[PDB]
């Protein structure tokens, strides 16, 4: 007759939630080497033939784990840095005066703020000054008798504590690899046209994944990776108007951004080993910061995006873009991080459906120093200046679009820039794989009987 | 696009009767009780689930694209217009008389 036989090491698994290890290759950058182990050298990928697995990018746990880890690491990376509490004092901010061709637009952005703060002794004060950008200055008790005596403060210094970033922290988005713990493994979908949700029929087992760059941006996705075969649109239900549309490009667009000013830096001491950095003066003339996007590459990219979006909806609809509907600055404009400088670039020249003949689109940008990155959660960070002009270059590899509501008796669909939820950017990379729990113990009938 | 229909335009019943209101849609639906007052009250969500605080008189079933909103043991308190919604689209409801 048939008897029960126990098999240990059976290649079966179930869906599970667990904690993954960080790994990276070889001043201490936030994340990475300070708290990570070595990567798996010469890693292998094992193709599982005749296996179909249901992957949902949206419900993946790895996104929440990455979000939590990044927030925690950032907070620690700011924990030992100089706090700016002693600088939340009355400021007197007047027009900055320069000797060389300052444009009338910049006279309203760079303010010369004089203030009385502490020095490195408990019983003495200093009278100092610094140049600040207008978005970081809040007005109090405007003096209508002598406008130069109006009071100002650093933005939100009355609400929370502003901490200056340590100058020795490396803010480069170094890719971090996620390794499964023992007993668990990561399954990856190798179906080049996978929508991000559904029964992937070409899968492989990965002990530890490739690295993902923790790039922070809004409206557009930067760096990361390109689609292998075509532009892919991922969006939960797709017809639900509160769900982001993620456009994963197969071809990048090069963008060059810059702060052309010298911004000569001054260092002022506040306390016993607590120092503050701020712009001292500017040598030369003053220009706005800006980004340069190639005209023809952008026009081709939008043509292809419109075609692929049209393929995912009713054929009797025109696809058009429109400028962002507004909201906080972090989502109204495109957010960068180039060597610690936070740029807020006006993208209304890219999404206005204006096929501008310009060879290079140029977008004006604002630069802000007091940044609350995680939608208001966390310590406010003060980004110190860097003397000299700054240039940077990056690849635009995707878009975050939001559908412009909906109605009947309409023959066109309008998409606008969106984003602001950092998890979506992290999904645009983590979507390729999910984590499984090995269940090696199985039973089956056979003719195996004990001699006993 | 999501297409919808709603029928009847009006309903008249006696107290204690069991009545149905039909809405057709290719998408997720919910139902609300709209009174001449402060706000509509949500009755049914998902294919057929009841909200907390709703008396056990309201029910529903789906088959294909049709939903019936079966209302058992109709009471005087149930005189209202019953609205049917798919996402941002709300279809004018059936006015119940009694």
């Amino acid at each position: 007759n048939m008897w029960v036989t126990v098999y240990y090491g059976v290649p079966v698994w179930t869906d599970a939630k667990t904690t993954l290890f960080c790994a990276s290759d070889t001043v201490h950058n936030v994340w990475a080497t300070h708290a990570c182990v070595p990567t798996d050298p010469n890693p292998q990928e094992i193709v599982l033939e005749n296996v179909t697995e249901n992957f949902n990018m949206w419900k993946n746990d790895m996104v929440d784990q990455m979000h939590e880890d990044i927030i925690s690491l950032w907070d620690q990376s700011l924990k030992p840095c100089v706090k700016l509490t002693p600088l939340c004092v009355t400021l007197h901010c007047t027009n900055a005066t320069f000797k060389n061709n300052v444009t009338n637009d910049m006279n309203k952005e760079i303010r010369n703020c004089s203030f009385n703060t502490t020095t490195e002794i408990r019983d003495k004060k200093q009278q100092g000054y610094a140049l600040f950008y207008r978005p970081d200055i809040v007005l109090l008790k405007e003096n209508r008798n002598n406008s130069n005596n109006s009071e100002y403060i650093l933005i939100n210094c009355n609400a929370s504590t502003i901490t200056q970033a340590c100058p020795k922290v490396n803010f480069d988005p170094i890719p971090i690899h996620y390794c499964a713990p023992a007993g668990y493994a990561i399954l990856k979908c190798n179906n080049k046209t996978f929508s991000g949700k559904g029964p992937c029929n070409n899968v492989s087992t990965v002990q530890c994944t490739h690295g993902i760059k923790p790039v922070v941006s809004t409206q557009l996705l930067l760096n990361g990776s390109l689609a292998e075969k075509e532009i892919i649109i991922r969006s939960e239900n797709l017809t639900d108007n509160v769900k982001t549309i993620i456009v994963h490009l197969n071809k990048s667009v090069e963008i060059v951004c810059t702060r052309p000013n010298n911004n000569t830096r001054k260092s002022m001491r506040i306390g016993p080993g607590q120092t503050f950095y701020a712009t001292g003066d500017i040598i030369g003339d003053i220009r706005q910061a800006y980004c340069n996007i190639s005209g023809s590459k952008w026009n081709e990219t939008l043509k292809r995006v419109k075609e692929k979006l049209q393929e995912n909806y009713n054929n009797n609809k025109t696809i058009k873009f429109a400028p962002s509907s507004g909201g906080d600055l972090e989502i109204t404009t495109h957010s960068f991080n180039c060597r610690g400088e936070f740029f807020y670039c006006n993208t209304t020249r890219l999404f206005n459906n204006n096929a501008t003949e310009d060879e290079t689109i140029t977008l004006p940008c604002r630069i802000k120093q007091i940044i609350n990155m995680w939608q208001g959660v966390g310590r406010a960070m003060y980004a110190p200046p860097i003397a000299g002009n700054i240039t940077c270059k990056s690849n635009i590899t995707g878009l975050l679009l939001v559908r412009d509501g909906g109605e009947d008796n309409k023959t066109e669909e309008i998409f606008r820039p969106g984003g602001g939820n950092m998890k979506d950017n992290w999904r645009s990379e983590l979507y390729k794989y999910k984590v499984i729990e090995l269940k090696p113990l199985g039973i089956a009938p056979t003719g195996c009987k004990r001699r006993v | 696009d999501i297409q919808m229909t709603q029928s009847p335009s009006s309903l008249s019943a006696s107290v204690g009767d069991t009545v149905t209101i039909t809405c057709q849609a290719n998408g997720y639906l919910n139902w609300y009780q709209q009174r001449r007052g402060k706000a509509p009250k949500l009755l049914i969500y998902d294919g057929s689930k009841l909200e907390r605080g709703v008396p056990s008189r309201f029910s529903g079933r789906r088959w294909g694209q049709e939903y019936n909103l079966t209302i058992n043991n109709l009471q005087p308190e149930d005189i209202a217009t019953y609205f049917c919604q798919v996402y941002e689209f709300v279809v004018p409801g059936t006015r119940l008389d009694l």
Partner: nanobody
Amino acid sequence: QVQLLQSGAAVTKPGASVRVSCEASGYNIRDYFIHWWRQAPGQGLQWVGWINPKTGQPNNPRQFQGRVSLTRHASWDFDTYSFYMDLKALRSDDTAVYFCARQRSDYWDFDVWGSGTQVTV
């Protein structure tokens, strides 16, 4: 206890911008979208738009673009939020009751509604 309070009725003239407010309290506001609806007399409910309480992003349908500005102001410690609908190019056709509501699910299920602000033009 989830609560949405609204301002009282307002009467103005065509072309005069009108603000309708809704104050949310008693729950974690940051986790749910707030939607606005317009109910003209004798009609059904027209969708006006949604606002994300954490990012401030408005989303309005075509018929309200350039006319309706949705915003939000967070209070201290995020215990309450004040949401506003600013209607600019006001016309006599916009007489209606304006409602705020919470989206608690992926089905656009609106559990709690405000009292409704009557706007007459």
